[PDB]
Design a protein around this ligand. Structure first.
Ligand code: PLP
Ligand code: PLP
Lengths: 380, 359
């Protein structure tokens, strides 16, 4: 992970959307790390059988996924709970159409990954928010506010765990308190756990559906190798739905939308990601966590005008620019014109995103060093 | 062992340039979020000119991860719940499924078998249109009968769609496998008026045996129809194609013209061979003469077997599973479809097993 690899001219959204060669790109959430070599090998092998017609899932894929949830989170699942989706944003949309009617209520907790909002409002459901509470280097759930929203008749809650963009890995105690509110008010939960496998040394990912049979009965769990293994462009996702009635409604929507399984390389890459890549995974968790610690230290020492939220997992870094007292336009201009860095503006993540930025730390230390140098320069 | 003649794809190796472009992309060992290839609009514009003499704009092109999703998106974009969608059986069963699973009303205008071909019944179709059809699904070339519609047939269809204000989804997935005596005419190519009411679904999937990579192109000249379609895609969470769909598409539509010319000759020779073999050795069957694709539609009605007796006889006595016709709707009863997109040796084996089955 130490050596920079050129992504210019690979049709990378991150690196090939802006033509200006002096810009460094740390916005969209993929990594400037090479994929594990066993995934490259598995792909090379499949290309050596030069027919690419309709394919079913590999015969062992269910067992591979069952062993993955058991190994990673000590979660025992059934093969029949597994549904595929070509990405997690489609699974959010499928869930909204499956478990709510038009003008019924869906709750999210900003600041949040923007398709959480967009998929609710574009499907003509009513959007409710329970904004997270900034507290120190971190964020908590305001359970009193959330309960007040649940009392208004919420059908569905989209949970982000770990939460993009702030990097919170929810504790077992936080998820149980959430779980008891979902039971109390009979709320169905979509648990977007796409960030579940990049977790820092002092934290543990608890699948919400793993806490009890009661919570398994009411939860749609969204996972993937996309973020973990930098294969998002292959569109491989896994939806785990323990409740046969919820699973039948979900797969009904997929069916009426003409969905009939993943592309060939999604299955090939997922098969390798979840069997042959454990060492690469251990090493990238250590590398990314050290990157997060270096970034927090660098900003604390050299850009005291900024406040960092300490991430507990994933490779995204959430930064409060409040005390610079800049307009979004003025701050973006400085970053682009003076910094020459492209980072995510926080205002797109809804309430709590005002005057924040999100920088991608899923890159070699030497690149992160340059990003942080340019960030210091930008606000000097 | 069992031959699987029901499969929807060819048993031929992908053209080498597609294998080469794939191997080349895997040299760059990052598989993150990706843009369509920069030149892709120009490559597609050039394809539709090279192949069909059809002039398109770049702005008309939308991507879809398959044609059945494009059928579903079109039904959701252009009709409301409880509005009527028309198909022409016998037809690819997903044509029906995408209407009924979306709570639209199914109408049918069954095609009429004549000699060893089929025609549209324009008198019947017009009577269905008079009942207020919103959307028609046109299959061109038509699976499973292999009809390549003539410009004159499409123009007669077009006058009706103009007269009753019917929006057309043209499923043109089989558009590149056309036999020597025929030409594919995209319905949207016929005039500005018909371009303005048509969604055209094309793909390299069937042509180049890369259906597993899920690359499709949807061409929507009418800006308001195009925006309605992409709005459905957006609310379903679709962004674009997977990396290898783009890689394989770029190459299929630029570097494989000699492979395509050659496959067209081989499949038509297979079609002619199958035709003669069945005429000579199995006179209990009648066969529709295909003009395109790699599917053969066989009438088994003179044998007077139930679907179950026929299917059993084929699997037991023939060690072959075919596509059964009944699920294709009216005109599919006591028919089978067999895939002839295979090496001649496989097809000769397939035909021996049919002859032995219905001996
Ligand atoms: C929380 C969350 N959900 C879903 C997604 C979508 O991922 P994909 O496009 O790989 O399915 C992302 C990607 O950034 C994400 O961070
Ligand atoms: C007419 C027609 N449309 C569509 C398809 C396949 O659609 P998709 O691209 O969703 O696999 C086929 C393949 O059998 C076909 O014959």
């Amino acid at each position: 992970f130490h050596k920079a690899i050129n992504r210019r001219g690979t049709h990378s959204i991150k690196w090939d959307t802006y033509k200006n060669e002096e810009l460094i790109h740390a916005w969209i959430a993929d990594m400037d790390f090479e994929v594990p070599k066993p995934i490259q090998t598995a792909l090379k092998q499949r290309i050596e059988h030069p027919i690419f017609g309709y394919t079913l899932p590999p015969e062992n894929i269910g067992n591979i996924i069952c062993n993955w949830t058991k190994q990673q989170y000590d979660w025992d699942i059934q093969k029949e709970w597994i549904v595929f989706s070509a990405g997690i944003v489609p699974a959010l949309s499928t869930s909204i159409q499956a478990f709510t009617k038009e003008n019924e209520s869906v709750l999210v907790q900003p600041p949040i990954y923007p398709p959480f909002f967009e998929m609710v409002t574009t499907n003509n459901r009513q959007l409710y928010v329970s904004p997270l509470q900034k507290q120190n280097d971190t964020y908590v759930i305001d359970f009193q506010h959330l309960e007040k929203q649940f009392q208004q008749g919420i059908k569905l809650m989209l949970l982000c765990s770990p939460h993009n963009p702030i990097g919170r890995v929810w504790t077992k105690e936080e998820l149980l308190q959430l779980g008891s509110l979902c039971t109390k008010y009979n709320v169905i939960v979509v648990a977007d756990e796409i960030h579940s496998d990049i977790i820092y040394a002092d934290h543990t990912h608890t699948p919400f559906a793993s806490l009890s049979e009661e919570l398994a009965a009411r939860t749609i769990t969204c996972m993937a190798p996309s973020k973990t293994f930098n294969i998002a462009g292959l569109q491989a996702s896994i939806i785990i739905i323990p409740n046969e009635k919820l699973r039948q409604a979900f797969t009904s929507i997929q069916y009426r939308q003409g969905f009939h399984g993943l592309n060939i390389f999604a299955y090939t890459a997922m098969q390798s990601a979840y069997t042959e890549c454990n060492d690469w995974l251990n090493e990238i968790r250590l590398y990314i966590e050290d990157n997060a610690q270096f970034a927090w230290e660098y900003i604390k020492t050299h850009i005291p005008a900024l406040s960092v939220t300490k991430p507990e997992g994933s490779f995204l870094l959430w930064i409060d620019c409040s005390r610079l007292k800049l307009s979004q336009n003025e701050r973006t201009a400085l970053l682009e014109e003076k910094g020459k860095i492209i980072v995510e503006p926080g205002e797109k993540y809804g309430l709590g995103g005002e005057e924040h930025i999100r920088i991608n730390i899923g890159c070699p230390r030497s690149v992160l060093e340059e990003i942080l140098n340019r960030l210091r320069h930008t606000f000097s």
